[PDB]
Write a protein that binds this ligand. Sequence first.
Ligand SMILES: [Zn+2]
Ligand SMILES: [Zn+2]
Ligand SMILES: [Zn+2]
Length: 572
Amino acid sequence: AVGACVLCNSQTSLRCGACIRRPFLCCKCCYDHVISTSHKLVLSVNPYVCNAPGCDVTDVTQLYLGGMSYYCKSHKPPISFPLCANGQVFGLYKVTDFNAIATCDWTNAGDYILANTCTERLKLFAAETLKATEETFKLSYGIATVREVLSDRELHLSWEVGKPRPPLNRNYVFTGYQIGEYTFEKDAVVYRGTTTYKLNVGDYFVLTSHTVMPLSAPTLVPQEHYVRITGLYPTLNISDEFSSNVANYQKVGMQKYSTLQGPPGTGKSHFAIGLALYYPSARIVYTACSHAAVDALCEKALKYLPIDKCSRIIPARARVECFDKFKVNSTLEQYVFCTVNALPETTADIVVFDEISMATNYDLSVVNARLRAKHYVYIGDPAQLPAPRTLLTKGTLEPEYFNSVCRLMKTIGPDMFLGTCRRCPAEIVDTVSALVYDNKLKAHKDKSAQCFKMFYKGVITHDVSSAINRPQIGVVREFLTRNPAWRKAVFISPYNSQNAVASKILGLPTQTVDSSQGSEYDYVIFTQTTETAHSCNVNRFNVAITRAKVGILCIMSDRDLYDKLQFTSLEI
Ligand SMILES: [Zn+2]
Ligand SMILES: [Zn+2]
Ligand SMILES: [Zn+2]
């Protein structure tokens, strides 16, 4: 019942009973909170409530201290002081931003803007409060029950009435009843179970709302600049392959934390693995939010680092199939590859946190709490996709508000910038360089002359709110008959329902823009599907077109983005 104030760190016996995270508030801050919000319950050793029998006064502003006890205006003794007086709430040991975080419902972009522009302690309060709200929102969804099992990949579901149905894609992960985690995609629904289990009738699925633990560490440790490389020992025999990053690797050792902005195909994994070769005796923990990003770092390490000095940390509750070529769960290996949520409590010479646009401040804080490091390297790209904000429905979240690292990269600039895209045909590099990189991204490849664009709005239908554009898929099918080399293409769209329709009509492998991030293919076929804020988002557009190594076909709905594509236009 005694701790440090979230706002001014002052010692207090007071916590807000109305905040969902019950934060410590000092006398001055507790007062400014209760006096400006609907939050009137204050908790000390005991709640500040009227102690008189049967009384219901709990509002701190209507309460008084009568001896060692609390009473309202109606039950107070003649000798009593108000609990709220002279800008303070009475307590042992004797804000506009805090109030907005404490009372917002997290449905507006302004809520996330504030959560990233506030003090460091309020960033943790906002992250914990937000994450708690997001988990309690998972309880709002209805239970799915097996009505009938059709096959090994298809079944029929009966939903709970009165409660809304969660969107059906790979982002929404259910728990069966615990018969393993399950995902669903569109009466016959397609199911995918983590554990191969014979689906029984009457079995039910719920999105597993986990308990949000409190945060302790900052999103970023205080910056420290050094005169020399600190705690790290450079090689004098650095391979030519990594020579381009030697100045950047030295910058890494000369400051507590460093940020690396790496546009698509500019060498992010190459940089991360090269850091190990440049400081060969340094113990590095490689982390990312997703198993996929951690696996991509494992792939690069498998090529350049000694396999016996690596370990892939996999939590006992395996939620996906991941990297198999390293010794599993050997926390003490020189190179540890592990998702943020599975990080052990350990130390490191360098912590490399990859795909930083996908991290939340909650993730930034967890990394700082589990890992004590000499150096922290944040690698990613604020021009790429952020983590989905399931509660956010009003407004667009700009890259400078994705998290603390993205905020720094967009305001003061990244510490390091990989400026040459080695993946994409020049038409793609030139389009995205002008679009999101202020013309600082350069092409290594020539123009492929295999980048096409077609302006075709088609017809937009909807599987609930997920969009489908059958005429856009029809245009693709027509193009494929005339361009058989594109048979090997990956179909990409901003919607899973569009991808499900394209998978049946085209037979191409399918991928959403959000699930394509970090991946690359020779040929990409993209159908914009709609003109929505979602399908027109420049970071999503950036990711979509930068998946291509050789060619891309963009079937566009939006005039602006279509005109910005430096591609050959097709007719029909
Ligand atoms: Zn409160
Ligand atoms: Zn305070
Ligand atoms: Zn009373």
